[PDB]
Structure formats: structure tokens, C-alpha cells
Design a protein around this ligand. Sequence first.
Ligand SMILES: [Zn+2]
Ligand SMILES: [Zn+2]
Ligand SMILES: [Zn+2]
Ligand SMILES: [Zn+2]
Ligand SMILES: [Zn+2]
Ligand SMILES: [Zn+2]
Ligand SMILES: [Zn+2]
Lengths: 397, 365, 395, 367
Amino acid sequence: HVQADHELFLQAFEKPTQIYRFLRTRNLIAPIFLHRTLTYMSHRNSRTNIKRKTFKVDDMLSKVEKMKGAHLQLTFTGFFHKVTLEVLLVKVCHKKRKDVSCPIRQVPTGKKQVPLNSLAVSSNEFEPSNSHMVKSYSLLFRVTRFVAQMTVFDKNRRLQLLDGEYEVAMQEMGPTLQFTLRWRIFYQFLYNNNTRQQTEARDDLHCPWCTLNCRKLYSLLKHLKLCHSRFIFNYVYHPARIDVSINECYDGSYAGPVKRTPITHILVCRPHNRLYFHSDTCLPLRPQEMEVDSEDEKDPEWLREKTITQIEEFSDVNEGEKEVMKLWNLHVMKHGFIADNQMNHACMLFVENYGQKIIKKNLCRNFMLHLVSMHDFNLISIMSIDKAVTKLREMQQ
Amino acid sequence: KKCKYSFKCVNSLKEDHNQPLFGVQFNWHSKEGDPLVFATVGSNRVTLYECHSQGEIRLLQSYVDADADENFYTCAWTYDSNTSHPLLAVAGSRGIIRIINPITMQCIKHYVGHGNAINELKFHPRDPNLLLSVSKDHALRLWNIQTDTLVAIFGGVEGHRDEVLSADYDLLGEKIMSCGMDHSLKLWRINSKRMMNAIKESYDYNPNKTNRPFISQKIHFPDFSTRDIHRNYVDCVRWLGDLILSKSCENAIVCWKPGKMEDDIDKIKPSESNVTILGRFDYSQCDIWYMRFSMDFWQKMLALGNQVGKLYVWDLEVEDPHKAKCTTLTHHKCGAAIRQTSFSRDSSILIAVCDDASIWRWDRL
Amino acid sequence: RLQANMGAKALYVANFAKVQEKTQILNEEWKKLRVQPVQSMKPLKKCTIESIFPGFASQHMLMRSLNTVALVPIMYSWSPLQQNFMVEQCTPNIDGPNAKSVQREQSLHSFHTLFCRRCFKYDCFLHPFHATPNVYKRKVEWTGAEESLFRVFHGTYFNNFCSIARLLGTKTCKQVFQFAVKESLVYNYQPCDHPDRPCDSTCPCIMTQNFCEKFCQCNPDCQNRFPGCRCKTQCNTKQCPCYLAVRECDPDLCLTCGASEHWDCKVVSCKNCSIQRGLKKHLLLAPSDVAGWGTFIKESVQKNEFISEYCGELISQDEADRRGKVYDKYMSSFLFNLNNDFVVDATRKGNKIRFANHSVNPNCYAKVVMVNGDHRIGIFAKRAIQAGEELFFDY
Amino acid sequence: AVEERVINEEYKIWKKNTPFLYDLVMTHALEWPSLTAQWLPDVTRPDFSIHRLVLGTHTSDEQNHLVIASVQLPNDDAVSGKIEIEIKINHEGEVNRARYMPQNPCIIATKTPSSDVLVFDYTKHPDLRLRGHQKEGYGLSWNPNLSGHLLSASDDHTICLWDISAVPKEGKVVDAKTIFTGHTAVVEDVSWHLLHESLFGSVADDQKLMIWDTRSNNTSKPSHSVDAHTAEVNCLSFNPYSEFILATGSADKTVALWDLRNLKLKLHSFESHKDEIFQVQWSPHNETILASSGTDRRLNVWDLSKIGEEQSPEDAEDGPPELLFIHGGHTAKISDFSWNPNEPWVICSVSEDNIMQVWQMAENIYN
Ligand SMILES: [Zn+2]
Ligand SMILES: [Zn+2]
Ligand SMILES: [Zn+2]
Ligand SMILES: [Zn+2]
Ligand SMILES: [Zn+2]
Ligand SMILES: [Zn+2]
Ligand SMILES: [Zn+2]
């Protein structure tokens, strides 16, 4: 498994799944239709219509009528001074017309013994009465063996102090006190008829991306078939096989004041393989010969004939010179040479490829002249030329 | 000399579609004494036709393809080697070359290797199995219908640089001329060892025995080219022994040959450039493209049409081509442009087509 | 003036005689054959034939259908290619008998002027003119052939008598010694000419805004020349020196990458010299489901992987302008501008990768790459592509 | 762009899934979009029965056509059926709301974008013009008990009431028999009480549901006034079976239930619709069923009998128990919908993108 096709295995299964990863969040936060209401997936519903017989919407007000028929757990804490303790709520009222001073009333809730160096319950004991007479309300926490207030409730019936522990100072007429308030499937992937991956499902029937807990295999096959339809699902009982395959004919498209024409659609009332052609001939290519005889290699003969007729058209070149020229052209075209050092081998191939041709035409002198000519361009060493021509005249002799 | 030809219009048929015809051909391969037969073609309507002494052109067969947009161009006749049956060969604008067997009345064979329209079809005269095809795609092709495969492609980098309009073998079947819109009259050859062993290997081809493709022997190098015989388009070319006859939109036929007058045809090099204009035939009113001429089997005469209707006939047995006695033929009803004419095996019957869906006939007397 | 009318008439009657006997033997061949005549069906659409002349009745016949066939798109003629193209004293044979004497500079005139350095050929299809004449310049019986051979041999060897005695063989060391005693008396790459002067503002290399290569005959200790990389790995990343610029790898200079190894195999470390070696993917032709013909790929590829290279005729800018103006009627513009100097026109010649088409969502792409000074096209992959899939890239 | 792509992809998923949910599906597109749809009481029964529909139009640079159309419904057998347009009536400007008389089904009142609303009678073929407002609106309703009584509303702070029985046939224009004005903002719905002709209800954009008495001769004070929702109130609907109970639909993404015996307490607030609700209608063939739809592109239907019931955890993950069905077959703003008074659980629904679906839920859902 190379990384490219393995990344294509991810990428080919990513972009359909990534839209489904988006539609998963969209369908959960904004469902299209309730999954319980499907006929093929109906086990999710777990109720009947028995209660509608004895029901009455005129009597619904009677049902809610009989329905119509904060728990500040201010717990004390360890004191810090140098026993018993008590809390109290101080109510401040508004300035009335007759009375000039504010009404004052200290309501002690309850005591509790705590060490230094228990709890007290208060289940919504504001007692403001909503009569436009409770201007403010404080909560004191006294100690002994050390008293102060702390704004717990705000003006608008809001929570001022946070949860957790806390501490406070004290002032008579050092000592202090504390408190603590409390309010099996198997996804057999197959793409291009290639087993890119073979897995086994973790859970039995938990869908791979929708993640619904269906207690039946027929519901899972129909859900994957109907919903999430970028793939074509085919499954056979064989521990269960699920043959996932990308739908390469899916209708990915738009598919859905201003003028437009009317229509009437009704749905329910009562329920590689394409042919090929040759390059130069354009004849139909048989499936038997596709990989064998790969065209576009083994460069064509018209280029060779062009190299022949071009230098043959040259006026101021001799016969044997043109002969060795076409021989060198056919040699370099039959075996392309890009590197310059490989040319040192190329002459050693030339006598090993066409030496018998130059002996049969008496072209050794102009061959050595061509060797010296390429030597002028600093392509090859002179001792290599000595070796090559000695080998050539050895095989010729 | 006098005309020596008592021509008279024996029949003038008109088809019921009103579409310009593009070709007509007689069954030269038929034997002697049998009832003669020829075939015309429109855009999407090929029609075989009999002919009698009293002008009774008995309608024999008429095929039409499903796709109406196809535009047929030319037709040809051939005889089978084994079954010894007739075979019509047709083509059109769809890039298709169909072979109709008139006895069974079916499309027994069809070939497709071109990109665009077919201009003209020809068959090798000696060996009846080969089949040359000219097309607008700047290249020719050569097929073998006995083995159902392609033989060769007479085109390439050195081929015509424009639409190829026509081509023709010689009478012996050893050298082919070709012409088109590129102002070039290019020669080919089917006599070298390469084309011979290629045809021989094509005869021995069988896709069921072996599993290989066919080695198509392309030809990217014609043996002679020239761009001075004409200036306008060259619509048709034919052989006369070892002489090239050619037309053009200049309203003049030209008879010539490559090289000097003493240079032999079978020793012309690729770099040969000189030519020799042997003679010319004059006429007028041939501006419209896709015009043709024709000859008989013996090639004793020559027929030609014009874009008005007054057709022309020239002699070939007599000497002095540029001083040859011409001949005209007119009528008070041929108010259309003639595209092609044709003769039977003998020079008795002449049949011509036109652009008004008309088919005219003439006969000696 | 008119001394060929009788000769023309003689040739014409000879033509008539030979074509007459040719038609005679053809008639003798045709008479051997015996073919059956046509036979009609007894008289669905209809077809009627009237007659303008009276006396002939109207002949009707029923129509007959024909078998359909799969149509294909239009394609003009072409031919394949793998390399680019371009379209714009006698000194007898040494082995022959009529040889004559000639000096070293004059003997190798045709050889030095016709030989090409950048491809090791003679009159190739991309190097129209040689650089300069100074590029090849460097710091008993005796026939003219033997004299010229001894002259060029002593020129290259500088009087090493044992070596000429080994090479020629016939002439001995003492004879050659006595004879020598009795003989003394965004622009295209272009090699510039300034051996005496240095690479300055007047040199056209800096004007072109391109780095020089091995083929230039300037100072080897210069700075304008482009030395090869020193990367051991495949160096197909942006960290490579060659991949920074448009250039590809060098065979001789880039020794560390291993480009100078034997080219017989195909498994190599350097994944950048594919254009030089030509390790292209086996493409195939097919009818496209978008517009006309198209190309398919057989084997899978990677991102930024080498698919193939474009090929065509190199021509000037105004040449391609008039060519495209001619192609405006046909509405088939397969042109591809290469650079300011030359441009590609592949209508008449090319390869399979030309048959690709344009799309707004590409998967492949093209890149200009200066392989040894040759500005070639490289068609690389912009996405991992499967087998038998369509190929598109924005022009 | 990507949002509409996702919406139409979900529509394709719904088109794949729809042969497992509904007993009948009939999606139809009109020549122009319709902000009104209503089944008629007439019916013809020759295997498929013929039913009739009234439909509005919303045109632009083209003549409007109030459509009386027909439809072919299979009753209990059979695969055939089509939509057909019977009558088209030219209309002054666009259409916002239209209503038929329950006493005389032939009389059909329609609103205009101008002041002068009109009333047609297709048997004779404006047959009866009507005026009194100063602007357009959405409110219109015939009285079920008393013939000729007709209420209408508009955003110019007026609620007109006509009684067409008093005028002669020659009199085509009729002034308001009375004009009620107690709100302090754009009133957005009014509707008669069904089984008591002497009162009606309304909701306005003052965060106020206001109940008005007809016997009282004060056209400014309502009988009751209650703050129903936190945001603007949109529409309401009375119950056909009972008389006291009614329902409201507000722009705070809620439907709610109230009663005419104690209007202070909200009985229950349904919340699944995720945008402004524009229409709610009680079912004729069932008592404990409610419906809702708006610009959320999903028509919800609720069952009141299934309220407050315990269910499975995987069943509770989908939604609350009372929500009966979510027909998401549309692809745009659900402009209107209506029930058929003589078939079980079947409805029609018209959207703004030329979509007019007609559908009936499966029997296995409600049983
Ligand atoms: Zn070269
Ligand atoms: Zn330089
Ligand atoms: Zn330099
Ligand atoms: Zn330089
Ligand atoms: Zn390198
Ligand atoms: Zn490198
Ligand atoms: Zn490298």
C-alpha cells in the first residue's frame, strides 16, 4: 500500500463523509424529519394512543388547574478569634409618608455550634412580600469564643456572591467568622475493484457516521441505502458483510417574487469499461491488448526519414561524411544520451553497434575524423578514442 | 471530323425529396448481356436503378439510414471474390464507409477510421479487395474488405495541408494520384516492397488466431509533389496511361506529367520539381466547388458538367488534345448545376445528376 | 520554342497505344469473371420517381432502413512526437581515391560547423545556428588524405609520435619523426560571445534575467553560472536548489543526487529528472464525455507527480499570432505560449497529452521547466488521480 | 449558496426517503407563488374522487389570477391522479389572505395591497367591494353563525367589521359597520369565535393577546388583555370541537395554548419550530392535534394527548414526545397550509418557491 492511493482511499472517503460530518451536526441540531416516524424504522416508537379515549380538551384546563392547586443553605464555618453562633437577616424598607425612619427588624433564622482555630438551613426565607416595602436585605454571620454581613442577594433578586467558601471581617459596637452557602458488521471497502481496506465493525449495528442504535439489520441496510446516499451499499450475511462502494452516478447537483412554469409530480399512492481507440489509426482497441504493446514509445520512422533526408539535402558534405552522419543520428536516436560522461560509453557502443557497417562501406577514416571532431568539443578523452579505434581496427582486421 | 455521336435525351427523372445529388456510378464489374444497373445518391438516400432500351429506368432498390443529418458524397461498385455477388460501397459526412450487399439487402459491413466527411472512394482495379478512401481530415486511407482491417494510411506530415478532395489509381494499379484544396497534386506508390508485403500480411491477418494489433504501415513521404499546375482548388484528378488529367475552378482541364517530356514516370526522384504541361481543354461556368468528370472503361472519350446544365463531351482517341474537337449538349429544361456524369461498360449509355434532384440520361444512335 | 509539338504527338499516340493494350489485357482479365445480376424485391416510408417526359409512369418503392453506427468526434491528421521541433575546396572523401591535401582548420570545417553540442547531433530540430566559431577553438608516400590525417592527429596530440604510430599503423615512428622534421615552417537561452571581456551589463545573459549553464564557453570560475545541487534525497521539494528556480536537475553537475548513474534501470533516487529520462505515464485516447476526444491515464499518480510533457512545433510570436488568426474560423486553438521568444504550436504534431481539455475544476497543471536551457513544458498532477479518469487543466 | 445546496441535498434525501413515511404524496408547482390555500366543502365523486381548492397568487408585472382548482384523491384503492385548474378570476394587485363564507360557500372574500378589498361569487361569473382600512394587511374572516358578518384587519391600527346582508344588490361599496381600535402597534391577527358569535379574539405586536366582546358598545376597550409571549405575536386559531380553548403562534419560536375561562395562565408552550411561525390550524377530523409552519421550511404537527409522556432515551434524543410529525418536503418559506374537512389526516401546503404539496401521514404513526 503506497501513501498516494492510501491517501486517495482517505480522500475519496473523506469528502462524502465530510459533508455527512456537516449534515450530522445539521441534522442533529436541525432535523429534517423524525426518524421514529419511518415505517421501515418504527421500533423506536414506544407508545400507543390509549389515553386519547378518556381525554377531553375542555377538561385540559381542569387537568392543569389541579397542577395549580432559592434554598439558601447558609452553612456556618470555623471562627477565628482568641462555640455557639447565630445568623440574622436585616431588612431595610422605603421611606413612607408618615414614618421618617426606616423600619428595622432582625429575624434570627437558627443557631449552630461550630469549632474555631454544623450548618443552618434557609429554604427561601426572604419574606419581602412584594409589597414595595423590602428595599434591601443583608445576611449576617455571628460567632463567639466576630459578626459581619455580606451581600448575598442583590437588589433585583439576583445572586451577588458566588459559591464555595468565603471569609469576612468583623467590627464590634481579629475576630471574624466564615460560612459556606449552597443553592458483527464489516465494511469491505472496494474502489476500482481493489481491496483497499478490509475492516470489522466495532459495534454490531451502530451506524458509522449517523450513530443511531437500531436493534435490527434490515433497518441499518435501508438507512444506509436511503440516507447518506453518496455510496451504494450491498450486504450479504457472511460473518455481516457490507460492501461499500462510491456512487459514481450520484445526482450531485442543485436538484430543486419570480416567474416559473408549473409542474405536477407524484411518487406514492398506495405502496474502466468505455471503449478505446488507437492513436494513429483510430481503430477500435480490443480489451485483450491494452497493457501490452504500449504505443507512443519506440519513436517513429518519419523522424528517422527526416533526419536522413535533411542531411542528405546538404550540399557541401561528401558521401562518406553523410553516411557516418546518418549512422551517428540513428545511433543517438536509438539510444538517447543526456549526460556528457555517458558519451564516453557511446562511442564504445557505436563500434559495438555499427562497426561492421562501416567496414562494409570503407568509412573508417571519416569515422576517425568524426571522432576527432567530437574530441574538439571536449566531449571525450583522447585515450578513450585510442581504445575505441584500436578495438574497431582489431575487430576489422 | 463530325460529331459521330447521335445523342438525344431519352429520360429526365426527378426525385421526391429535392436535395442536391453528389454522385453516380455504374456497375462496371457486371458481366456482358445481363440487365445493366447503376446507382445514384443524395444526402441520406442511395438509390439503385435499372435501365432499358426504351428509357424504362426500373427502380431496383432504395436504402435510407436512420440519422437524417448524414450527407452522402460518393458511391462505388465492386464484385466479391468468393461469393461472386455485387457490393455497393458508400460513405458520407458521418465518417462512415458502409458496404451494402444488394442480394441480401443488408449492411453486411461497415468501417470507421476518419474524423470528418468522405470525399471519394476508389477500388484497386486488378485486385478487387483493396479500397482507397479520401477524406477532409488531411489524409487518405486504404482498407482490405476481405479480411476486414486497414492496410495503410497515405498521409502524414508531408501530406496535404488542407482538405483532400479526390484521388485515383492508374489503370494497372501501381501508383495513386491525390488532390485537394491545398494546391497540391501529390503522387503515391503501391508497387514497392513495403506496400506489397504489407498487403500480403494484411491478407494473412486473423484476430482470432493471434492476439496482437495490426502494424499499420504509414507513409509520411510521397514520391512527387508540385504546387504550380493550379492556383485555385483542384476538385478531381484522373490517370490516362502515365499522364495526369486534372481540373480546377479556373474552368480548364489540364493534361500533364511529372518532369520533362523525356523523363520516365517510373524513375522520378522525391526531389523532382520540373513539370511539363502537355495540353489543355477549355470551358466555362465551373466556379462552384465539388465538380467531377468521368470516362468509360476503354477511356475513349470524356464527359463533364457545368454549373448551368449545358454539359460537354471531349474525345480522347484523336490526337492533338489542345486542338481536340469538343462537343456540347444542351436542353431547355436543365436549369440546375451538374455534379457528375457516368457511362456503362460500353459507351452507349450516359447518365448525369444535378443539384435539383434531377437525373438526366442520354444514349448513342 | 515550338520544337515539341511533334514530340508531344508522338508521346500521346504512344500513350494511346499503351493504355489501349492495358485496357485490352484488363478486358481479358474481366471476361474470365462471371458475376450474378441485380434482383429486386417485389413492390414503412415510400419513395416515388416521376418523369418529366410523357410516356413513362411514376415508379414507387417502399423504403428500407439501415443499421446505425456509433459516431465519433472530429480529428485532423497528425503524427506522434517525443522531442520538440522548429520550423523557420570540395574536400573529397578520405577513403576515396581523389583525396587532396587540406589543413586542420579547413578539413574539419563541415564537421565543426554542422555538429551541435546541446544534443550531440547534426542539424537538429531546435538549434538553428551554432554559437560561434571560437567555441571549438582551443589553446615514404604521403597522400593528401594521409597528410590531412597526420595534420589533425598532430594537432590534437601535439607531437606524440608513438600515439600517431599506434593509430595510423602504416607509418612508423622514424618516418613520422622525419616527416615532422620536414613539415615545420522569461527569455530563451542563447550562448553569448565575450571571451576576453567579463560578464557585464553588455552581456545578453543578465539582460535575459536567466542563469547561464554548462554550454556557455565563459569563465568556469564565474558567478553567473548555475552550479548543480548537493541533495542526496529525491529533492522534489521546495528545499531543493533546482526546484526553487524553474530549472530541472543537471546530469554532470548534480553528482550528489545520482543523476550520472546508469540509465538502464528505472528505480532511481532523483524524482526530478523525469523530463530528461522520459519516465512518462502510459496515457490512452478515448472519446470524452465533455467535448470531443480526451485522454485517460492507466496507472495511479501522486500529488505533483510527473504525468507527461507537451510537444509541438516551436515558432516565433508573430508566427503563432497569424496561425491562431487562421485557426479562428475552425475554432480549434490548441496553442500554448512558452515564453517571449518562442511559443509552441502542436496542431500538426504532438502527443496524447495535447488531447486534454479545459475545466474550471482542474486536477493537473502545466509548468515551464528549463531542462539544459531547453524551455520545455511539464504536465504535472495537482491531485491524486485514478485509472481511466478524465484529465483537465486550465490553459 | 452552500446553504441552499445543503437544503436541496436534504430535499433529495427526503425524495429518496418519502416512500416509507406518507400514504399519499402529490407535489405541484403553480404558475405564480401563492400566499393562500384553502380546501372547499364541495366535492364530486364519480376510482379517484374530485376535490376542490382555492389558491391565491403573488405576481409581478403580470395580471393576478385567483385560482379555483381541483385535485384527484384516491379514497381507499389504487396509481393515478393529477392537478387541474378550473376557474381563474382577475384580481386587483397581489393577495395576502382570502376566506370563504361557511354559510354560503360560493361567496369568497379577498384582500388587496390597496385599501379596497373585494368579494367574488363564482356562480354568477368585484361582486361586492369593501372598504374602511387605510393600508394592506393579512386579517380576514367570515362569521360561521350569522350570515354576512365579516371581520378584517390592517396595519393602520383599525379592525373593520361589515355586515353585507343589509345593503341592497345595487350597493357594491359598503362602509364599515364598525371600526375597533384598541391596540398601540401593528395588529397582526384577528379571528371570530366559532360557537359564540358575540365575541372575537386578536393578537398584536404590543406583546398582547386581546379578547373583544361584541355586545359591548365600546370600540376601544377589549374584554381581556394578556401578555402572552416575550416577543412579537403573529397568529392564532380557535378549536373546532371545544369553544374556550385556543392556540397562538409567536415570533419567539413558539406555539402556545390558552383558554377563554382563565386567560392568565398559559396551558402549554410547544417549541420545535426554529423561526417565526406564520400559520397554525386545528384539524377538523381530530380534536387533540395542532399544526404549525413558518419560514423554517419544515411543517410541524403536534399531538396534545401525547403531552408529558415518558419515552425511551434513544427515542427522547430525537425530540420531545408531543411532536407528532415534521413534514420537511418544502424547500422555501411555508406560506400557507390547510386541512380537508372530509378526509383523514390529509393536508395541503403552499410555499413561496412554487411548491404546493398535498400529503397524508401513515396510519402506523397515529393509529
Ligand atoms: Zn543539433
Ligand atoms: Zn555569461
Ligand atoms: Zn558567463
Ligand atoms: Zn557567457
Ligand atoms: Zn540532479
Ligand atoms: Zn537536483
Ligand atoms: Zn537530482
